Amino acid sequence: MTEYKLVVVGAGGVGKSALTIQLIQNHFVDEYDPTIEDSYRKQVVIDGETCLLDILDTAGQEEYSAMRDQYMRTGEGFLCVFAINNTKSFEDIHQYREQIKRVKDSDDVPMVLVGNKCDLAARTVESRQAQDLARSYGIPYIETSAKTRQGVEDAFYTLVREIRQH
Amino acid sequence: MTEYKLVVVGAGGVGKSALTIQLIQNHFVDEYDPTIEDSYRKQVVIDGETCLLDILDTAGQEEYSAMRDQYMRTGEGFLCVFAINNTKSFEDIHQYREQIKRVKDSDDVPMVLVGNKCDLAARTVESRQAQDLARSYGIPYIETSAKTRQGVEDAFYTLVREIRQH
Numbered sequence: 001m002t003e004y005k006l007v008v009v010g011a012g013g014v015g016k017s018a019l020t021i022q023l024i025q026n027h028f029v030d031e032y033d034p035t036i037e038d039s040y041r042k043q044v045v046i047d048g049e050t051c052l053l054d055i056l057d058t059a060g061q062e063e064y065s066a067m068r069d070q071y072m073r074t075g076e077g078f079l080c081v082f083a084i085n086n087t088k089s090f091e092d093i094h095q096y097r098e099q100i101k102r103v104k105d106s107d108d109v110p111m112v113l114v115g116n117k118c119d120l121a122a123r124t125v126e127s128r129q130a131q132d133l134a135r136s137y138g139i140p141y142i143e144t145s146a147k148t149r150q151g152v153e154d155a156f157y158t159l160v161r162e163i164r165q166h
Numbered sequence: 167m168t169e170y171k172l173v174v175v176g177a178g179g180v181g182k183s184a185l186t187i188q189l190i191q192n193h194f195v196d197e198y199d200p201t202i203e204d205s206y207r208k209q210v211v212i213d214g215e216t217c218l219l220d221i222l223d224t225a226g227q228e229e230y231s232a233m234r235d236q237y238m239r240t241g242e243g244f245l246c247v248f249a250i251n252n253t254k255s256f257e258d259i260h261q262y263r264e265q266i267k268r269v270k271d272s273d274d275v276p277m278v279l280v281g282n283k284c285d286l287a288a289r290t291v292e293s294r295q296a297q298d299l300a301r302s303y304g305i306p307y308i309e310t311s312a313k314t315r316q317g318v319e320d321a322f323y324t325l326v327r328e329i330r331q332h
């Protein structure tokens with residue numbers, strides 16, 4: 001079967017694990033997921049295609065020096081996740097994207113911008129802000145909540161279709 | 167607010183109305199929807215943007231001669247719908263797409279390919295077939311079911327993001 005190697009990426013705290021656990025095990029992690037080389041494998045059917053999702057749920061903080069380069073090399077598509085109540089994690093996206101571009105030696109890698117925790121009242125990054133960063137990268141922007149499951153399958157499935165047209 | 171003028175298009179029978187009724191009124195129409203200039207208007211929030219969906223649910227059969235040209239001129243994005251248990255409706259998609267291209271005077275119009283009725287056992291058009299037609303057009307392919315609500319918000323929201331990057 002077609003297999004898709006997806007890497008979830010973003011700053012410490014933004015909900016990388018909670019998005020993945022919500023997709024694979026169907027529940028919201030208020031606990032601390034393992035967050036090193038966490039790999040999840042799932043047979044799914046996406047638009048009628050039977051396919052294997054192999055996702056790497058990555059660590060945030062930049063002790064991940066060139067161990068990023070390793071897992072970025074192998075990844076076909078990347079979810080780039082920030083949290084809508086944290087502008088630093090948004091600012092940081094630019095850094096994750098360049099590092100990906102640097103390692104893939106390409107200006108266009110399958111990639112989705114995901115503004116997570118959209119269930120929270122107190123957002124510090126307006127959708128418009130992120131919408132027009134995505135526009136600026138030429139990639140979809142999707143808002144999610146791992147807590148309510150909103151946008152979750154959207155974000156993951158959109159990325160899989162991004163890889164399909166590549 | 168940002169408003170998005172969407173036109174649902176496809177051959178007689180494929181589920182154009184049932185997709186729209188499922189999005190707007192949240193239930194599956196086993197009855198005969200009105201199917202002429204059916205317009206639905208809904209305030210929705212898509213990825214954190216408050217926006218107005220104005221959808222034209224169109225008639226299938228080609229008594230719609232140049233009255234197509236009218237509503238195709240004004241449409242920003244099109245859902246192009248076939249039914250996965252009918253190869254003629256699939257074959258027909260090419261005709262809807264050219265007519266759109268002819269009227270918009272453009273090779274790329276915001277557009278999604280939707281293979282509807284994916285809840286049915288007896289499909290005559292494999293996903294791969296359609297996947298690689300979509301690839302051939304450079305547009306997303308999404309499988310739906312108006313009956314089970316599968317893929318419905320996916321299809322409609324993906325098209326709205328298609329228009330956003332235009």
Ligand SMILES: C[C@@H](OP(=O)(O)OP(=O)(O)OP(=O)(O)OC[C@H]1O[C@@H](n2cnc3c(=O)[nH]c(N)nc32)[C@H](O)[C@@H]1O)c1ccccc1[N+](=O)[O-]
Nearest residue numbers: 011012013014015016017018029030035060117145146147
């Ligand atoms: C060690 C490093 O961990 P990390 O791996 O960089 O952190 P993650 O990005 O994996 O983030 P995780 O999935 O662990 O979720 C973080 C917190 O935000 C909450 N959260 C995630 N998604 C949502 C959502 O949509 N809604 C709401 N309301 N909350 C959500 C979680 O329940 C959790 O308490 C990390 C770094 C800095 C701070 C935290 C942090 N951490 O793991 O706790």
Ligand SMILES: C[C@@H](OP(=O)(O)OP(=O)(O)OP(=O)(O)OC[C@H]1O[C@@H](n2cnc3c(=O)[nH]c(N)nc32)[C@H](O)[C@@H]1O)c1ccccc1[N+](=O)[O-]
Nearest residue numbers: 177178179180181182183184195196201226283311312313
């Ligand atoms: C007049 C013209 O009508 P039309 O407007 O071209 O037809 P539509 O494309 O709007 O199609 P509609 O939404 O009316 O649904 C058609 C039939 O398929 C069923 N259907 C739609 N979506 C699904 C789904 O996902 N699952 C299942 N199981 N069935 C689904 C409906 O319940 C209905 O019985 C038309 C033309 C030819 C044939 C029929 C036809 N018609 O309206 O009945």
Ligand SMILES: [Mg+2]
Nearest residue numbers: 017033034035
């Ligand atoms: Mg984690």
Ligand SMILES: [Mg+2]
Nearest residue numbers: 183199200201
């Ligand atoms: Mg109809």
